Amino acid sequence: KMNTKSFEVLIHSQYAFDVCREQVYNFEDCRQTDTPLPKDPIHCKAQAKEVLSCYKEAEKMDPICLSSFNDSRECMFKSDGNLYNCKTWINQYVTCQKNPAAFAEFLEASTAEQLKSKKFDFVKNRGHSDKYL
Amino acid sequence: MPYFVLLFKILIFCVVAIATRGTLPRYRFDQFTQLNWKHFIYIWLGFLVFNLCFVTFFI
Amino acid sequence: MNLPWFVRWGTDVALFFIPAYTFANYPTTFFVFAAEKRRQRRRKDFSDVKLRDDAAFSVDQVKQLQTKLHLKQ
Amino acid sequence: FCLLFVLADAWGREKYAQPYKSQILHGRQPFGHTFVQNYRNQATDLGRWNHNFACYEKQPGCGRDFD
Amino acid sequence: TNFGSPFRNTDSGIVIRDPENEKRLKLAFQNFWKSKQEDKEFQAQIKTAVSKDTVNFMFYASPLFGALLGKTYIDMFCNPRYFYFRAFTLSMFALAGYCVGNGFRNRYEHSLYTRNYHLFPKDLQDALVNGDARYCISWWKQ
Amino acid sequence: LKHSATVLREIKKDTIMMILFIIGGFTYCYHMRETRFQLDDDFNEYVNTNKQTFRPIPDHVK
Amino acid sequence: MNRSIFQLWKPESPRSNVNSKQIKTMNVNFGPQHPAAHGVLRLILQLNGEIAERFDPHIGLLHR
Amino acid sequence: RLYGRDKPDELDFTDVWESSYQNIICPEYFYHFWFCGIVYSFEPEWTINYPFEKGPLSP
Amino acid sequence: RVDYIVTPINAVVSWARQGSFWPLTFGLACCAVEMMHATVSRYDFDRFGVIFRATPRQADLILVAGTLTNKMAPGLRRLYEQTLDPKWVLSMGSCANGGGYYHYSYSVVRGCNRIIPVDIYVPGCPPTAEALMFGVLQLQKSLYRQINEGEKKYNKKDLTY
Amino acid sequence: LQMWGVGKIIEIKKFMKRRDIELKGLQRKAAPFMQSMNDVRHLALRERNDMLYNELLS
Amino acid sequence: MGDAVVIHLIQNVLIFGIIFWLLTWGAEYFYTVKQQLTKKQFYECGFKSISELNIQINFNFFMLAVFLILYDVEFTFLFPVLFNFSMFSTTELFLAFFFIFLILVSLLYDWLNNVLSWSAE
Amino acid sequence: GFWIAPLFVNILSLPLYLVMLVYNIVCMLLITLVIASITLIERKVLSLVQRRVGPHYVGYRGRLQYIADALKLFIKGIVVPEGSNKFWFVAIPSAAGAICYTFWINSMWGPSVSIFDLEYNLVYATILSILFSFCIMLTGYFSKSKYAFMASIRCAILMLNIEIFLGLLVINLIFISESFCFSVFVIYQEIIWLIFIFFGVSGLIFITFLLETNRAPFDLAEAESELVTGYSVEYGGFYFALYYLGEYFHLFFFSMVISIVLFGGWELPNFLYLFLLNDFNIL
Amino acid sequence: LNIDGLHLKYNHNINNVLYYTPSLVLFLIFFNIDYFSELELFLPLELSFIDIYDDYYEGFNNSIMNDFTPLTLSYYSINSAEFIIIGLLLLLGSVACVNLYK
Amino acid sequence: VNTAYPTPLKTILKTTPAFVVYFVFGLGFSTVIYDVVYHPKDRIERFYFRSSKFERLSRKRDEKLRHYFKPAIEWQPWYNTSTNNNTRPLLRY
Ligand SMILES: CCCCCCCCCCCCCCCCCC(=O)OC[C@H](COP(=O)([O-])OCC(O)COP(=O)([O-])OC[C@@H](COC(=O)CCCCCCCCCCCCCCCCC)OC(=O)CCCCCCCCCCCCCCCCC)OC(=O)CCCCCCCCCCCCCCCCC
Ligand SMILES: CCCCCCCCCCCCCCCCCC(=O)OC[C@H](COP(=O)([O-])OCC(O)COP(=O)([O-])OC[C@@H](COC(=O)CCCCCCCCCCCCCCCCC)OC(=O)CCCCCCCCCCCCCCCCC)OC(=O)CCCCCCCCCCCCCCCCC
Ligand SMILES: CCCCCCCCCCCCCCCCCC(=O)OC[C@H](COP(=O)([O-])OCC(O)COP(=O)([O-])OC[C@@H](COC(=O)CCCCCCCCCCCCCCCCC)OC(=O)CCCCCCCCCCCCCCCCC)OC(=O)CCCCCCCCCCCCCCCCC
Ligand SMILES: CCCCCCCCCCCCCCCCCC(=O)OC[C@H](COP(=O)([O-])OCC[N+](C)(C)C)OC(=O)CCCCCCCCCCCCCCCCC
Ligand SMILES: CCCCCCCCCCCCCCCCCC(=O)OC[C@H](COP(=O)([O-])OCC[N+](C)(C)C)OC(=O)CCCCCCCCCCCCCCCCC
Ligand SMILES: CCCCCCCCCCCCCCCCCC(=O)OC[C@H](COP(=O)([O-])OCC[N+](C)(C)C)OC(=O)CCCCCCCCCCCCCCCCC
Ligand SMILES: CCCCCCCCCCCCCCCCCC(=O)OC[C@H](COP(=O)([O-])OCC[N+](C)(C)C)OC(=O)CCCCCCCCCCCCCCCCC
Ligand SMILES: CCCCCCCCCCCCCCCC(=O)OC[C@H](COP(=O)(O)O)OC(=O)CCCCCCCCCCCCCCC
Ligand code: SF4
């Protein structure tokens, strides 16, 4: 449907959740049910289509966001889909997408260490009390 | 990498086992079975119950 | 001319540890450069991605800013 | 002795706030457990079930959304 | 540290050591606190689990209590003829007391920067949550 | 196994100190649990800072 | 602790199957080439459950 | 107990504590392990290199 | 020719079997005490890679250390036959060599060589610990050299045939 | 030591749960889009199957 | 639990054992085995074994296996509650303690009757 | 080429299976070398405890003693007793060797550094141990030596005890980790090693380790004084080498298991600086 | 018991031809309880589509991490009566075993 | 000035070469396992069961789409092999 891979879809959604909020609310209300069992998608098809169209619209990004998007993708590749471990890079990508003009000064006020290649190896650096959940 | 420290610990425990073999005498099968089934099973179950109680207290 | 016994023992310990430590830290010996190249290839590009029409900064401007800031080194 | 101690402590923990009361006396189980346990339980009478958030209306903070 | 920062998984993936960034973030938050020091309403609405006076007293008293306990322990059980083990155990008790006090202080800091999260502006909130001070450029003089 | 006065005094002091040590350990564990409660409260406040919106269930659910 | 005399001993009654050797006892040649044996002891051992019952020592392997 | 198989008229809690120490926390795997493995290994080897050294003899 | 591969492999096999030379835990008389003395630290047998094994199946050397009696000769023969090949036999002590002090007895066999093929003899009564070590080392050297003692003849191309 | 270690393990578990709260929040943020894509694919397959069944059974 | 990789690894291990089989066969070239009367007979410490294949043992400790059969399942029943003890409630805690107490009582009865030791027959 | 490609679809994949086989062979050879080095270490440590040099002349300063002993065991000939069952006498050691060389699959060398993505590591260990005990019992039975059969019975008793002992240990351990995977233990052991909780039962942990490793005081099956050699009284050469290798494999891997589950695995002992450490860092 | 492995000299052919082969034939002919279960390959796998469906809302609402959840929900919540019955049964069985030994 | 080693340390050092050889072999084995499990994935992928339900679904969505969804939606009556050597069901029944 999107021709986009799962982790990239998650990264894009982490920002698109704030642009198509009304469509997301409509879809959620349509799928709401009195039991945990899922509702038939035939009823929510229209809301899903609207949400997907807005997601297509939102997936576009400014070129300045490319470095942040790439580092977030690398983090989400080295970690098998753990959004918490890579939220900082995803947060930077969301910030760049929201008002990208300020991202120029954001990058300008960068330290030498930050201005370095970002390599992720979780086996070498597990972290602190990482539950992987 | 983690396997460096893991190998260090494995070597330590292997040396401990070798020293224990060189030091301690040998048990009898009946003696060890009696000891186990009369004391150690109760010890293990009591330790498990204590752990359950402590976990319940802290949670 | 003589050296302390503990100095000699530390020399032996270093001889054992430095090679083992380096080997442990680099299990993929001589292929770290290949890993870096693969990571660079995985890294996406402006053409690969789709960009907004009302971009605050153009692709050339972003490239110039990255070159000025030395973002990747 | 440990059982008696923990039971006394659990009964004394009523002083603390609701989320920190003893789990012996207060239940905290997954949504799969709670839904089946309190589906038509008039004793609890939690109310309707929030499908996309997996909780009843009367449970504290059932539907918690961003912004 | 045992757990690291509560907002993010510290040293997860890539390990980052940026003392300049740490100093800039600390300076930004210090400037924020100094700027809002005079605001009586803002000071009134600040909350913490344990009082600052209480945590200071605990920090400065726990090591002393540990030292007293160690002194009693060595007096009761240790032979006065020797001193190496007595000094070691007294130091261990003092370090235990210092550990209790430092934990009190660190938990006070954690409560201060967690309960009062909503009072900070958006930029400072983002800077605190993330490891980068670039979200709060204006605060550290740039 | 008759015991002398000094040995009996040492045993009695050991028992007393063991009792005091156990009581202190239990008290410290109680304090640690209280600390855990405080940390949970702090983190709950932090998380709920921005998650303040509650969406009512649609009327069509019933 | 309760009594265990019956579990500990088993007498043999005349022409009785239950009070008799209901098993084929292990007749082992403990030694001479046995690490425990000093080297010249040929002890015919009647084991029943790995418990010695009957001893027949032969000690002439070092008669000189 | 030292003189025969009999037992004291009045047992004391010292025996209880000794039995608990011996059973619950088995000291054999620590006491002997240390005393032999870690300490006795510090002595020079008593071996004599026969091909290049000879043992003491007398005229 | 196979010799190109056989000879180096022969040397490797000889070296391995010399390094790992496990005798049998079998002692009959006072010479067993000397064998234990040779085993213990003062003359560490493990230095030359010889470790005693209880079962004959796991033994390379038959240390006949002590007197052999008529009542035991069938047992010694059975042990020798049951020991897995290849194997060597080392007689230790005068009693094992030629009957020793009891050569004029009515019960002692006049020598273990009458029942077993004795590869080597270690004179003594009791042989010293160093004497037993010397005998074992000489037997090891002979064993290493036994694989190729220059039996096969060299042709014009220096290859054995 | 047993009591203190159990308390420490419980503290670690509760910290893990605290971070799981934020992980669940992020997963909730990312949920609706993937759900919509999956629903669209499922409905496309259902439409294909319905067309095939109608053609075969009509 | 794994996948078909486990079966493929079993096959690979069999091939690795074939490697040792080749080494053992090649070793045959460096020794000769003579035929002797007692070279292929049971070893009984330097003498002929009187009995072979009639090696019945006395199973006078069978109560231990009997109780192991029960206690293995008793312990196995405790795994789900230990795994999901974070979900424990009043009922689950009571049931777990009830089961543990039952196991303890069974062990105590066994000790009282003295069936955990070797017997005459 | 269009009409020829289909013929090679299954022919082009055999090299991949060959590569997998080669990698498995390399891993097995490396673990065999590790076990040989462990044997040499055991000999040297016993020599130190007994105040003797130990292996010193098989290779310069005894550097190739294990190689020499392995080659000698290969060289030694084997003969099956006439009264024994020819098929089983060779079948049992083959299965024992296969199981021992399958042991290494249930090992982790990092957070997810394992040859296979196995979750029930403890279950695998228990099953493999039971299979090895089966093989030892069958060896003792089919070798009609009375000492071998008694060794098999002792092995059965040891297995009976190990069942309950290791089951209770695993029950206590899983109560914290909540999983059978070795990785889940290290995350909880990062701050403090799990052995601190079990400090009271440290003696029982040591007993469990020794019993599972079949070391003293639990060397009943292979008791060399009570029995001639044990279950291998009638086995020589590589048949006995396989049993020795299996015993050392079990020792090494259960040492790894104990280290991972109770001593932090691949986490450094940070508890030595617990007092000076800080539990949080807020800027 | 039966260490040597020698067993009773039994000939199964007589019973196989007298009673078991025809009875088995009749039972196989007249026995089938499977009502309408369909073999794999009965229809193309491409017609089945439910296995691809994923519920991401339930996924993020689910906090389970082990496959013992049904087992605990059965043994300790729903079938706790049978769990206690099994415990009592095992205790009584141990008592009966001890009495049989005596 | 005989700056020789202490007696205990010198005694201990005898067995050190065995430790060094053991470390060499163990590092070789661990690195071989790491490389074998790293090359196919270009990383040390976390175990599937060591992940949340949502993470598992996200990880396997792409594989499901590539292996089942596309053939299912592009299916034709004559695509299936006549030998019945088709892909097995995802949930085998
Ligand atoms: C085409 C490519 C070309 C590439 C470039 C060219 C080639 C480069 C290759 C470089 C590496 C080659 C190996 C060098 C070895 C040097 C040996 C040496 O120093 O000689 C003296 C040393 C003298 O030893 P010795 O005569 O036996 O001992 C005398 C007495 O024992 C008394 O002994 P002592 O008192 O003297 O003390 C003994 C010990 C004293 O040392 C210590 O005390 C410290 C060490 C022990 C640590 C213990 C930790 C655990 C503690 C447990 C508890 C406490 C202990 C006590 C316990 C009991 C207490 C009761 O000292 C040593 O022997 C230290 C030397 C360390 C050598 C190992 C180095 C590498 C190891 C890691 C693997 C590396 C992989 C490759 C990496 C490549 C990239 C860098 O020589 C030896 O005999 C060697 C002993 C060690 C075994 C080495 C095995 C090597 C096998 C070959 C491996 C090939 C693969 C790797 C290379 C691949 C190519 C890159
Ligand atoms: C978070 C969890 C943490 C763990 C939790 C654990 C909880 C367990 C609870 C349950 C158990 C409780 C146990 C309590 C026991 C105490 C009870 C008590 O008070 O009883 C009174 C009872 C009554 O005694 P008393 O009648 O008063 O008589 C006094 C004694 O005569 C004594 O006479 P003295 O005092 O005149 O002489 C003894 C004194 C002797 O002292 C000395 O001689 C000074 C030290 C000399 C060091 C020698 C080695 C130097 C090595 C240098 C290497 C350089 C190499 C350079 C080249 C490198 C090249 C690579 O020994 C010491 O006290 C040494 C203590 C200092 C150790 C070193 C520093 C370690 C610091 C650790 C980190 C601290 C960071 C803070 C945070 C901590 C957080 C946990 O006292 C005793 O029995 C005392 C026993 C003392 C034993 C000392 C043993 C030291 C360790 C020996 C190691 C040997 C290894 C050899 C090599 C091995 C190779 C494989
Ligand atoms: C004499 C006359 C001439 C005869 C000619 C004979 C025929 C010649 C060949 C003719 C045909 C040539 C065809 C060429 C074109 C086609 C090539 C092709 O299809 O491949 C492309 C194919 C796919 O292409 P690609 O994606 O571009 O590849 C990029 C990399 O895959 C990307 O790598 P990555 O970033 O993904 O990183 C992971 C990579 C990186 O991993 C590595 O391979 C790097 C190195 C890892 C650690 C190595 C440590 C080894 C030492 C450990 C300690 C041993 C101690 C005990 C032994 C004693 C040692 C003294 O690992 C792997 O891919 C997994 C492979 C695991 C290899 C297994 C371990 C190797 C050592 C075997 C040891 C055997 C036991 C000891 C034997 C003792 C004998 C005395 O690439 C591969 O799969 C490469 C496989 C390489 C295997 C390892 C090669 C050896 C490396 C150097 C070490 C040599 C040690 C020798 C020891 C000797 C001692 C005496
Ligand atoms: C691998 C085996 C290792 C075994 C090592 C054995 C070495 C020999 C013994 C050395 C003992 C050294 C003394 C300190 C030992 C650690 C004590 C401990 O657990 O405290 C950590 C604890 C740390 O707990 P904490 O984690 O709550 O610390 C504060 C936490 N924050 C930061 C969140 C506030 O220290 C204290 O807090 C002080 C004591 C509090 C009261 C309860 C303590 C219960 C356990 C006491 C055990 C005492 C045993 C020794 C008795 C005296 C012997 C002289
Ligand atoms: C040349 C003559 C050949 C004669 C025929 C060969 C006979 C071979 C007999 C043994 C192998 C049988 C293979 C077929 C069964 C595969 C079952 C299966 O699905 O497993 C994978 C399954 C994989 O399932 P999955 O969960 O990955 O799901 C697959 C998903 N789809 C359908 C989409 C592909 O295994 C598991 O699920 C769990 C792992 C099991 C690991 C078992 C390890 C122990 C195996 C011991 C076998 C011993 C055999 C030899 C000795 C005994 C006598 C036979
Ligand atoms: C991935 C890494 C792989 C590494 C593999 C490394 C393993 C190497 C294994 C080498 C094995 C060598 C075997 C030698 C056998 C001949 C000698 C012998 O046994 O002697 C006794 C007997 C001969 O005994 P004899 O009667 O001559 O007596 C010799 C004694 N003297 C000298 C005193 C007379 O062997 C024979 O019968 C010889 C003739 C027949 C065999 C001829 C050679 C066949 C080779 C087959 C190779 C098969 C390869 C398979 C590969 C695929 C495997 C999956
Ligand atoms: C899996 C392997 C085992 C793991 C076990 C878990 C770790 C436990 C660590 C030790 C904690 C203390 C336990 C109690 C010790 C009691 C000793 C005792 O009885 O003292 C009095 C004993 C003797 O006193 P006694 O009174 O008991 O007996 C003597 C009797 N009279 C008085 C008549 C003479 O004194 C000693 O010598 C004690 C020395 C203790 C030293 C222990 C060292 C152990 C080292 C190895 C431990 C394992 C390390 C693993 C490292 C892994 C790293 C990755
Ligand atoms: C699981 C392994 C680790 C151990 C964990 C459990 C520890 C349990 C003991 C904690 C300390 C108890 C202090 C009691 C002080 C006291 O009253 O002390 C009173 C007297 C004092 O005796 P003295 O006058 O000789 O000092 O002691 C006693 O009465 C001894 C009581 C028994 C203690 C044995 C050890 C504990 C065994 C398990 C508990 C069951 C005991 C049953 C006894 C009949
Ligand atoms: S030769 Fe001498 S030492 Fe040896 S057994 Fe005969 S009498 Fe004893």
Side-chain angles (χ1 to χ4, degrees), chain B residues 47, chain F residues 11 15 18 22, chain H residues 13 17 20, chain L residues 200:
Chain B
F47 195 84
Chain F
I11 295 166
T15 303
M18 177 179 58
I22 295 166
Chain H
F13 298 98
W17 287 107
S20 303

PDB file of all heavy atoms in Angstrom, chain B residues 47, chain F residues 11 15 18 22, chain H residues 13 17 20, chain L residues 200, ligand 8:
ATOM      1  N   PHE B  47      13.153 -21.677  50.638  1.00  0.00           N
ATOM      2  CA  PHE B  47      13.748 -20.522  49.977  1.00  0.00           C
ATOM      3  C   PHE B  47      12.808 -19.956  48.920  1.00  0.00           C
ATOM      4  O   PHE B  47      12.672 -18.734  48.787  1.00  0.00           O
ATOM      5  CB  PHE B  47      15.086 -20.916  49.355  1.00  0.00           C
ATOM      6  CG  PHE B  47      15.937 -19.746  48.962  1.00  0.00           C
ATOM      7  CD1 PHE B  47      16.747 -19.123  49.895  1.00  0.00           C
ATOM      8  CD2 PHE B  47      15.930 -19.273  47.663  1.00  0.00           C
ATOM      9  CE1 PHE B  47      17.532 -18.047  49.539  1.00  0.00           C
ATOM     10  CE2 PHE B  47      16.713 -18.197  47.302  1.00  0.00           C
ATOM     11  CZ  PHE B  47      17.513 -17.584  48.241  1.00  0.00           C
TER      12      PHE B  47
ATOM     13  N   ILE F  11      28.159 -14.759  73.476  1.00  0.00           N
ATOM     14  CA  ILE F  11      27.001 -15.328  72.789  1.00  0.00           C
ATOM     15  C   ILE F  11      25.783 -14.428  72.963  1.00  0.00           C
ATOM     16  O   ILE F  11      25.027 -14.187  72.013  1.00  0.00           O
ATOM     17  CB  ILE F  11      26.731 -16.755  73.301  1.00  0.00           C
ATOM     18  CG1 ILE F  11      27.890 -17.681  72.922  1.00  0.00           C
ATOM     19  CG2 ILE F  11      25.422 -17.286  72.737  1.00  0.00           C
ATOM     20  CD1 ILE F  11      27.878 -19.010  73.647  1.00  0.00           C
ATOM     21  N   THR F  15      23.670 -12.515  70.023  1.00  0.00           N
ATOM     22  CA  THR F  15      22.231 -12.645  69.808  1.00  0.00           C
ATOM     23  C   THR F  15      21.552 -11.280  69.784  1.00  0.00           C
ATOM     24  O   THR F  15      20.701 -11.012  68.924  1.00  0.00           O
ATOM     25  CB  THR F  15      21.614 -13.524  70.895  1.00  0.00           C
ATOM     26  OG1 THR F  15      22.265 -14.802  70.911  1.00  0.00           O
ATOM     27  CG2 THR F  15      20.126 -13.722  70.644  1.00  0.00           C
ATOM     28  N   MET F  18      22.360  -9.515  66.595  1.00  0.00           N
ATOM     29  CA  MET F  18      21.632 -10.127  65.490  1.00  0.00           C
ATOM     30  C   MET F  18      20.190  -9.639  65.449  1.00  0.00           C
ATOM     31  O   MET F  18      19.662  -9.319  64.377  1.00  0.00           O
ATOM     32  CB  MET F  18      21.678 -11.649  65.615  1.00  0.00           C
ATOM     33  CG  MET F  18      20.889 -12.389  64.547  1.00  0.00           C
ATOM     34  SD  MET F  18      20.986 -14.181  64.719  1.00  0.00           S
ATOM     35  CE  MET F  18      20.350 -14.397  66.379  1.00  0.00           C
ATOM     36  N   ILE F  22      18.602  -7.496  62.352  1.00  0.00           N
ATOM     37  CA  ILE F  22      17.425  -7.928  61.602  1.00  0.00           C
ATOM     38  C   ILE F  22      16.362  -6.837  61.604  1.00  0.00           C
ATOM     39  O   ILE F  22      15.746  -6.541  60.568  1.00  0.00           O
ATOM     40  CB  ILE F  22      16.882  -9.249  62.177  1.00  0.00           C
ATOM     41  CG1 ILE F  22      17.903 -10.371  61.982  1.00  0.00           C
ATOM     42  CG2 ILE F  22      15.559  -9.609  61.516  1.00  0.00           C
ATOM     43  CD1 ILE F  22      17.613 -11.606  62.802  1.00  0.00           C
TER      44      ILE F  22
ATOM     45  N   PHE H  13      20.737 -24.156  72.718  1.00  0.00           N
ATOM     46  CA  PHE H  13      20.621 -23.565  71.390  1.00  0.00           C
ATOM     47  C   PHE H  13      21.961 -23.458  70.675  1.00  0.00           C
ATOM     48  O   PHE H  13      21.977 -23.217  69.464  1.00  0.00           O
ATOM     49  CB  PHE H  13      19.981 -22.181  71.486  1.00  0.00           C
ATOM     50  CG  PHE H  13      18.581 -22.198  72.031  1.00  0.00           C
ATOM     51  CD1 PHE H  13      18.340 -21.926  73.365  1.00  0.00           C
ATOM     52  CD2 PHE H  13      17.508 -22.486  71.205  1.00  0.00           C
ATOM     53  CE1 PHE H  13      17.055 -21.938  73.867  1.00  0.00           C
ATOM     54  CE2 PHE H  13      16.220 -22.501  71.703  1.00  0.00           C
ATOM     55  CZ  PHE H  13      15.993 -22.228  73.035  1.00  0.00           C
ATOM     56  N   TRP H  17      22.409 -23.833  66.661  1.00  0.00           N
ATOM     57  CA  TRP H  17      23.128 -22.923  65.773  1.00  0.00           C
ATOM     58  C   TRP H  17      24.233 -23.651  65.020  1.00  0.00           C
ATOM     59  O   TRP H  17      24.438 -23.416  63.823  1.00  0.00           O
ATOM     60  CB  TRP H  17      23.701 -21.748  66.568  1.00  0.00           C
ATOM     61  CG  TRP H  17      22.659 -20.770  67.018  1.00  0.00           C
ATOM     62  CD1 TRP H  17      22.190 -20.596  68.286  1.00  0.00           C
ATOM     63  CD2 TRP H  17      21.950 -19.833  66.197  1.00  0.00           C
ATOM     64  NE1 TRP H  17      21.235 -19.610  68.307  1.00  0.00           N
ATOM     65  CE2 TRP H  17      21.069 -19.126  67.037  1.00  0.00           C
ATOM     66  CE3 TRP H  17      21.975 -19.525  64.834  1.00  0.00           C
ATOM     67  CZ2 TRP H  17      20.223 -18.129  66.559  1.00  0.00           C
ATOM     68  CZ3 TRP H  17      21.133 -18.535  64.363  1.00  0.00           C
ATOM     69  CH2 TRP H  17      20.270 -17.849  65.222  1.00  0.00           C
ATOM     70  N   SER H  20      22.617 -25.722  62.287  1.00  0.00           N
ATOM     71  CA  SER H  20      22.155 -24.863  61.204  1.00  0.00           C
ATOM     72  C   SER H  20      23.322 -24.402  60.342  1.00  0.00           C
ATOM     73  O   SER H  20      23.235 -24.415  59.110  1.00  0.00           O
ATOM     74  CB  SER H  20      21.403 -23.662  61.775  1.00  0.00           C
ATOM     75  OG  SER H  20      20.321 -24.081  62.586  1.00  0.00           O
TER      76      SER H  20
ATOM     77  N   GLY L 200      22.336 -17.116  50.928  1.00  0.00           N
ATOM     78  CA  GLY L 200      22.027 -18.081  51.969  1.00  0.00           C
ATOM     79  C   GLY L 200      22.141 -19.515  51.499  1.00  0.00           C
ATOM     80  O   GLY L 200      22.538 -20.395  52.267  1.00  0.00           O
TER      81      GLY L 200
HETATM   82  C1  LIG O   8      17.759 -19.882  53.364  1.00  0.00           C
HETATM   83  C2  LIG O   8      19.229 -19.730  53.664  1.00  0.00           C
HETATM   84  C3  LIG O   8      19.567 -18.507  54.504  1.00  0.00           C
HETATM   85  C4  LIG O   8      18.857 -18.446  55.846  1.00  0.00           C
HETATM   86  C5  LIG O   8      17.543 -17.683  55.816  1.00  0.00           C
HETATM   87  C6  LIG O   8      16.650 -17.950  57.015  1.00  0.00           C
HETATM   88  C7  LIG O   8      17.219 -17.470  58.335  1.00  0.00           C
HETATM   89  C8  LIG O   8      16.347 -17.817  59.529  1.00  0.00           C
HETATM   90  C9  LIG O   8      16.897 -17.346  60.863  1.00  0.00           C
HETATM   91  C10 LIG O   8      16.863 -15.839  61.046  1.00  0.00           C
HETATM   92  C11 LIG O   8      17.403 -15.362  62.383  1.00  0.00           C
HETATM   93  C12 LIG O   8      16.630 -15.871  63.588  1.00  0.00           C
HETATM   94  C13 LIG O   8      17.100 -15.281  64.905  1.00  0.00           C
HETATM   95  C14 LIG O   8      16.430 -15.881  66.128  1.00  0.00           C
HETATM   96  C15 LIG O   8      16.972 -15.307  67.430  1.00  0.00           C
HETATM   97  C16 LIG O   8      16.395 -15.957  68.651  1.00  0.00           C
HETATM   98  O1  LIG O   8      15.222 -16.117  68.854  1.00  0.00           O
HETATM   99  O2  LIG O   8      17.356 -16.341  69.494  1.00  0.00           O
HETATM  100  C17 LIG O   8      16.947 -17.017  70.705  1.00  0.00           C
HETATM  101  C18 LIG O   8      17.968 -18.077  71.009  1.00  0.00           C
HETATM  102  C19 LIG O   8      19.296 -17.487  71.395  1.00  0.00           C
HETATM  103  O3  LIG O   8      20.219 -18.560  71.670  1.00  0.00           O
HETATM  104  P1  LIG O   8      21.605 -18.229  72.418  1.00  0.00           P
HETATM  105  O4  LIG O   8      21.227 -17.855  73.856  1.00  0.00           O
HETATM  106  O5  LIG O   8      22.528 -19.396  72.347  1.00  0.00           O
HETATM  107  O6  LIG O   8      22.165 -16.981  71.729  1.00  0.00           O
HETATM  108  O7  LIG O   8      18.168 -18.857  69.789  1.00  0.00           O
HETATM  109  C20 LIG O   8      17.200 -19.717  69.440  1.00  0.00           C
HETATM  110  O8  LIG O   8      16.199 -19.893  70.082  1.00  0.00           O
HETATM  111  C21 LIG O   8      17.532 -20.417  68.157  1.00  0.00           C
HETATM  112  C22 LIG O   8      16.367 -20.432  67.177  1.00  0.00           C
HETATM  113  C23 LIG O   8      16.628 -21.296  65.956  1.00  0.00           C
HETATM  114  C24 LIG O   8      17.582 -20.682  64.948  1.00  0.00           C
HETATM  115  C25 LIG O   8      18.117 -21.677  63.932  1.00  0.00           C
HETATM  116  C26 LIG O   8      18.449 -21.062  62.584  1.00  0.00           C
HETATM  117  C27 LIG O   8      17.232 -20.759  61.725  1.00  0.00           C
HETATM  118  C28 LIG O   8      16.556 -21.995  61.148  1.00  0.00           C
HETATM  119  C29 LIG O   8      15.317 -21.698  60.317  1.00  0.00           C
HETATM  120  C30 LIG O   8      14.130 -21.137  61.093  1.00  0.00           C
HETATM  121  C31 LIG O   8      13.413 -22.152  61.973  1.00  0.00           C
HETATM  122  C32 LIG O   8      13.865 -22.164  63.426  1.00  0.00           C
HETATM  123  C33 LIG O   8      13.146 -23.194  64.284  1.00  0.00           C
HETATM  124  C34 LIG O   8      13.677 -23.301  65.703  1.00  0.00           C
HETATM  125  C35 LIG O   8      12.949 -24.328  66.539  1.00  0.00           C
END
